[PDB]
Amino acid sequence: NIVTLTRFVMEQGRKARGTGEMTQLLNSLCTAVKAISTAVRKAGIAHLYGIAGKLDVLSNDLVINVLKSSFATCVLVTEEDKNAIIVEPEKRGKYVVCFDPLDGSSNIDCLVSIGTIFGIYRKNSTDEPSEKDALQPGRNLVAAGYALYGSATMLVLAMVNGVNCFMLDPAIGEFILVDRNVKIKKKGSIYSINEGYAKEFDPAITEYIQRKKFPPDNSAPYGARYVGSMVADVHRTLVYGGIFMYPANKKSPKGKLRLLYECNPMAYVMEKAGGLATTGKEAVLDIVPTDIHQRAPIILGSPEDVTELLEIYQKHA
Amino acid sequence: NIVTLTRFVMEQGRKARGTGEMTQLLNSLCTAVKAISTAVRKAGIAHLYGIAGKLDVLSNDLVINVLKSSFATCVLVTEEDKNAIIVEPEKRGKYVVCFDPLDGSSNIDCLVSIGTIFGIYRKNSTDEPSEKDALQPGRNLVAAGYALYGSATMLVLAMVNGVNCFMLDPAIGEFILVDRNVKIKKKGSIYSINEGYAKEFDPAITEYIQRKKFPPDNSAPYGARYVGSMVADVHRTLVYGGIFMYPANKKSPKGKLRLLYECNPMAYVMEKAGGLATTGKEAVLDIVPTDIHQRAPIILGSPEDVTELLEIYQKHA
Amino acid sequence: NIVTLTRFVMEQGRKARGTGEMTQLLNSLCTAVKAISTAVRKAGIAHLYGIAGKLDVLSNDLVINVLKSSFATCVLVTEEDKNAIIVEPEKRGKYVVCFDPLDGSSNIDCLVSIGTIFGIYRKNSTDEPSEKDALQPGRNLVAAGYALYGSATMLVLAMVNGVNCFMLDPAIGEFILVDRNVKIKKKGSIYSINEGYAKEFDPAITEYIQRKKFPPDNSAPYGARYVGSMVADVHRTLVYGGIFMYPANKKSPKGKLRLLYECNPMAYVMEKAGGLATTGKEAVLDIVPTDIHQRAPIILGSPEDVTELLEIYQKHA
Amino acid sequence: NIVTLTRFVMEQGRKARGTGEMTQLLNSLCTAVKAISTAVRKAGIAHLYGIAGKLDVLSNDLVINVLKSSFATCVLVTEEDKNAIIVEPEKRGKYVVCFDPLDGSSNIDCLVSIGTIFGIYRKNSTDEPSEKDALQPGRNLVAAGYALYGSATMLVLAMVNGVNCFMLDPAIGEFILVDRNVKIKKKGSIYSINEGYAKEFDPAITEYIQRKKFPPDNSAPYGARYVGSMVADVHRTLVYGGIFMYPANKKSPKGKLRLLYECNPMAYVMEKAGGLATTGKEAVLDIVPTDIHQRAPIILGSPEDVTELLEIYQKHA
Numbered sequence A, B, C, D: 001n002i003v004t005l006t007r008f009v010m011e012q013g014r015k016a017r018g019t020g021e022m023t024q025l026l027n028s029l030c031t032a033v034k035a036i037s038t039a040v041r042k043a044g045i046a047h048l049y050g051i052a053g054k055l056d057v058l059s060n061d062l063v064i065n066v067l068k069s070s071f072a073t074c075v076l077v078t079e080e081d082k083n084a085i086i087v088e089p090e091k092r093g094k095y096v097v098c099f100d101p102l103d104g105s106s107n108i109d110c111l112v113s114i115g116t117i118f119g120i121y122r123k124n125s126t127d128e129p130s131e132k133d134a135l136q137p138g139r140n141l142v143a144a145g146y147a148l149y150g151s152a153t154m155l156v157l158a159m160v161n162g163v164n165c166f167m168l169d170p171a172i173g174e175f176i177l178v179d180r181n182v183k184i185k186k187k188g189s190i191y192s193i194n195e196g197y198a199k200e201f202d203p204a205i206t207e208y209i210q211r212k213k214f215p216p217d218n219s220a221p222y223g224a225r226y227v228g229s230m231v232a233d234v235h236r237t238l239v240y241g242g243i244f245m246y247p248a249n250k251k252s253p254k255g256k257l258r259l260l261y262e263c264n265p266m267a268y269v270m271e272k273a274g275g276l277a278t279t280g281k282e283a284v285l286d287i288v289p290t291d292i293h294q295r296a297p298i299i300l301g302s303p304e305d306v307t308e309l310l311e312i313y314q315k316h317a
């Protein structure tokens, strides 16, 4: 007795009395994540090396094409694409999708785990679609999640109902349900941040990190891990607990990570996994975007760990 | 002309006038890594989840059996096996293999990169195969390398003449030569160590890290990265340049990484790469093993960066 | 624009305004065929050969567990199980599925093409499900088709609206629509029959074959082909045109092929594709079954070929 | 222990005491065969169907470029090439390879079994290489064999000492030894020929078939099978026993099949397997070639069945 993503998605579209438009959207997203996984594992490199005589771009076009053909999307927002992509009236459906096709293109050389991030907003506005229908607070996400292409490939889908983890079996190309209604730990034991920007940190970070390497109560210190690929670091934070920080160094208070297609999906997953996600001031999901490519700081993780750092931010006011 | 692992290892055996036994051993090694890689990528899990009705144990078993089958080995030293495995007299050859089947088996859940590490020695004794044949300085390695199962699968093989990186094309099951006689950068740009243990670091490590975050001139700090699996961190270090450190803290005054099957291969690879690998005190490859599961400290990376840490070491003697 | 079988099934479902029970069944057929294709192809035989220290049965068990897990079936008839499988109440749906898991099981050693054949009926009686709900004439089929595991794997599905062919891309585990709304050639140039039984043919089969080898008007003879796999031979007939015959004789006065799970599916594919299917006396599809393992004589293919044989049969009565 | 094709070719190379050049040839051939198998099974067709980002040709390109890259060949003759390919000076080795890259490419649309056939001669003349080095009788072949891309992929290799069969495990891309020192059944019970050419057969074939359908001792008739791909029909004949015939009829008094790359490799396999291969008059392997594209009649299979038919050819001279 086994549940595949295809079965699960359909079971949930039927329980929700959906017209089946979102189920086609999600089915297309499954197919594209498998085509991206195959290309990331380098199936076919023999042919470039002349056995018979770019990845982020190819991933981009695969996602845009497979979702345009689902007849379920009107507005798409991409990492690469400068402007929002408006789908032809012939293929329009009502969802808005914001995605990062290949998190950490800078990391493929060294074969670091890379991933795909996505958030689906339902178009709310009636009139002719545009950038505006994407500019919605993350609290308004219908579904979001990520595909991690690491040791194995995993899809994490979070919707209004919960977080569920699917493992790709590459022999038959099916995502099998492995972990269901995932909830993160209350407090973890690992902290993730790029410490080489230590000089540029704000004082609440400095204090937090010091408490984690030399606890005052004098328990154990927290282990550090920083892969430097946002899907790998957040995935480990979800599975194992802890806190992942990508705070405001002197790339202004904007932070580095983008709001619509990196911070917001991850935050929605955290919050459905019963964790927290914040700028340090506001919850990430409540920011109303000014721009699609807008950046935002983020700290996310196990409930207590995030709370502890918010209290320290509070003392430097 | 495309070069495949199988072609390269043959050509190299021809040039060295070897009787083929070693090429058999490398051939076998190749078949084992492809088998680990498929199992790691989770081909066939659907069966586990009842579609029709640990991995490290499986990995250990794969490596042991394929290697006994080359008729090229007599002693195998395994991470997972307390004592050295003495090969059956019928399948005995003159090589001694030390391997770590799955560098960091605990990184599977988190879907963090994992890897296999190996070192090959030639038995130099007349005496029957015994644990003693394994206790040879890493300066006696005939071949060493590793396979990283990351976003893609790559095997780096370091031999007498150099370091070449072969990527697996999983469609035809062939490793293609992608990088030929790799040389690591003089000076890197990233440092790698678990800073949670900052409570227990010796003053030289402490001074070096400080120097990377607050560079004594006006310089840009180094990026920090620590994935948490030796093969992923050492491979990013070989490819991108920088330094990787696992010093001895007090909870492991002799280090934590094992000398015969983690340290010496990685040290042999760095040295053939044109980088350095030390314990802070001596060179890793010159340490004479006493125990097959002996731990050693290791600092390895680009020559300049490793030398800054050594002058810092000597400055506190 | 790419149409995957997942997209296709789902769209057709929306237009037929089904409650999605059929789409779930049809999605489970698809997953079942992929798992069986991977097994036919010997992915993993190395493990049977000790790298780490019955296909028919297993395919039987993959079709039953996956069909049961769709909650869309109530009675299943297998070639392999002497009785109808009655789905347990909590998984019962409204469809009856008649299947042959691996047509031509004896072809696995010689390695010729084998396939999976299926037919779907709707249970329409209110009595507690029984073997009886499967005894419906082929004319009552909701959907029928096959999966051919040949040089490539292809799934052919036929429903009331036509026949469509899906090629498996094994690199992503998705079936792609390659031929849409297939019609068979009007007159073919290849006949298929096992001529070793020439001794036992009735005179109409004997006259038809003579007329194919020595054509009455001065045409070139027909080519001859007979693979020995019903799915391979009927698929060649569908795409290339011609006639496939497995009539009755001294042995097998009722024919060899079984009505519920080999004859009727292929006969529904042929009539939907514009070809004929006959016993020599009735159209196969109108034969009301008396037993689940009942046999029938079958002749199918291009309408002008099948007719020329029915005429010869009539001129011998 | 398992024996992979790579371990076998190497140990037989070590025993024959060769310079490693022919092992480099056989290893290269094994790599082109996997590359052809992946392409044939249509891995990657979604890209042709627009997911964003003639087989005959590619099979020919893969074989030529992979065989060139082993630096072990000097003349190659292909089904697809009008003239013998002379290898460039710096890649010249001493072997002559005659190959049929994709036996029966017309089976592709219909998805029927296809294969690749090869025979290897040693250049024996002293002149700068020419098609002349290919015009040697099949009795001079060093090695010959075929790969069949059927329900699974199998390579069959015949060398001085026997016929061995390797199944492709496509999960690891490794050929595993499954049946060693194959000998064919003395008498089989299947005959194989295209009987649509009955108005063209000579009287010995005509009588031969009559006797197989109407056995004069009233024993059982033989079963007929004809797939239409030489590799499938001939492989079935090796495995299950019987006779395969494609004689002269009117496609010249010389037959359809070609001597260097279809007839000689298969006849060689049959003789090392213990069967026979004749044209009706002489043995196929003693025909001295005149053109590289020369055709030949061929009859092959179980010794007793071929002899029976030779006695009928004798009764009509």
Ligand SMILES: Nc1ncnc2c1ncn2[C@@H]1O[C@H](COP(=O)(O)O)[C@@H](O)[C@H]1O
Pocket: A009, A010, A012, A013, A014, A016, A017, A018, A019, A020, A021, A022, A023, A026, A122, A142, A159
């Ligand atoms: N497959 C799905 N699983 C979860 N809920 C869904 C599913 N499909 C649709 N629903 C819900 O029903 C609403 C309408 O879906 P739809 O009419 O198909 O566009 C969606 O916006 C979802 O909230």
Ligand SMILES: Nc1ncnc2c1ncn2[C@@H]1O[C@H](COP(=O)(O)O)[C@@H](O)[C@H]1O
Pocket: B009, B010, B012, B013, B014, B016, B017, B018, B019, B020, B021, B022, B023, B026, B122, B142, B159
């Ligand atoms: N493929 C290979 N490439 C590198 N050196 C090898 C190769 N095969 C053998 N040799 C060298 O020759 C020595 C003996 O080879 P062997 O006779 O195969 O045991 C080895 O210990 C190596 O130093």
Ligand SMILES: Nc1ncnc2c1ncn2[C@@H]1O[C@H](COP(=O)(O)O)[C@@H](O)[C@H]1O
Pocket: C009, C010, C012, C013, C014, C016, C017, C018, C019, C020, C021, C022, C023, C026, C094, C122, C142, C159
């Ligand atoms: N995926 C499908 N493609 C074609 N027709 C379908 C499909 N799903 C349902 N139907 C038709 O609609 C009827 C009701 O479907 P259902 O309620 O799912 O049992 C079925 O018996 C079919 O005749």
Ligand SMILES: Nc1ncnc2c1ncn2[C@@H]1O[C@H](COP(=O)(O)O)[C@@H](O)[C@H]1O
Pocket: D009, D010, D012, D013, D014, D016, D017, D018, D019, D020, D021, D022, D023, D026, D122, D142, D159
């Ligand atoms: N791998 C092989 N298995 C069978 N015999 C071989 C093998 N390699 C070489 N030999 C024999 O030795 C002869 C010369 O080998 P070579 O020097 O490699 O060209 C060949 O023509 C073969 O008859």
